[PDB]
Structures are given as C-alpha cells and as structure tokens.
Amino acid sequence: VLTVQKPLRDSVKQALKNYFAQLNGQDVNDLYELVLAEVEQPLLDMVMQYTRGNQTRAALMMGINRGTLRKKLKKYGMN
Amino acid sequence: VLTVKPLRDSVKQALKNYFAQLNGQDVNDLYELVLAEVEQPLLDMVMQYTRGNQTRAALMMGINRGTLRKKLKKYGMN
C-alpha cells in the first residue's frame, strides 16, 4: 500500500534529493514541517473527499481523534 | 516546494490507488500509515545529507535532538 508500481517512499526520497540539490549554502531550519505540510494537506483533502465531509468517519479512518482532525484542518485553513 | 510534479501530487495519487483497493474494507490507521511512508525516507535523506551528524540534522529539520532520536529509534534507524 501507498504506491504511485513504485512506493510512495521512493517519491519522497527523490523530492528530497532534488531539493537538497537546490540548497547551495542556503540554510534550512523547518524541513520537518515543510515536508509535513506537503503531505498532510493532500491526505486530509483526500480523506474528506472520500467520506464526503463527514469528520467523524474521516477521523476514525485515520486513527486520530475528531478534535485532532479538526485542529489539523484549521491549521491548513481547510476550515 | 518539493518536486519529484510537486510531491503533494504523488501523495494524492497514492491515496486514490489506496482507496480504490478498499472494496468495503476496514481502515483505522491511515494517518500512521502515511506518516511512516514519509518520515522514513525523510530521516534517511537528512542523515545522509548531514553525514550522520544528529545535531545538524535536528537543526535542519527544525526539531530537537531528542525528537530526532525518538523517530530514528522508531524506524529502527537508531
């Protein structure tokens, strides 16, 4: 699970390689959150679409609590 | 941004494919599942880039050394 024939982890890896290549003595101190934003957003979007906006169902599918789910939606301004 | 196509698009695709293979199946840990698939390569690439220096890796990531160690242990990288 989490394929795009090639696993999702391989794409992440590739994206990081490309990014590192663009650094050139340029600092970075928010990599974790930067990658996270890139991933959480589409994840939330997709789950919501899947459950047709039902937050309870979306949270149960993700294994997080409803409150945390709403907190993440807010964080990304997804309401 | 992160480009492989922005990484976010790769994430979308993987989820579509995941969903398609659901067929009335039960899912209760999608968050953890996706997170693991992303955190592992992240930690790996970072460690290589900083040549194995944990502090440098922590600084780059914006987290503290302890959190980094916890995640590393978590994926059996440490």
Q: Which of B27, B8, B18 is nearest to A41 (CA)?
A: B8
Domains along the sequence of chain A with CATH: 1-79 (1.10.10.60)
Residues forming beta bridges with residue A3, ordered by sequence position? A7
B2–A60 CB contact, under 8 Å: no
Find the closest chain A residue to B31 by CA distance.
A62
Overall resolution, Å: 2.0
Q: How far apart are CA B6 and CA B15, in angstroms?
A: 15
Give the C-alpha distances (Å, rounded to integers) separating B22 from B7, B17, B30, B31, B34.
23, 9, 12, 16, 15
* Residues of chain A contacting residue B12, judged by C-beta atoms under 8 Å apart: 42, 45-46
SS3 label, residue A31: helix
Q: What is the DSSP letter of B28?
A: S
Determined by X-ray
| Most A CBs within 10 Å, among B5, B25, B28, B42, to test the A interface | B42
Q: How far apart are CA B74 and CA A8, in angstroms?
A: 19
Instruction: Please answer whether residues B38 and A14 qualify as being in contact, where contact means their C-beta atoms are separated by less than 8 angstroms.
Output: no
**How many angstroms separate the CA of residue A64 from the nearest CA in chain B?**
7
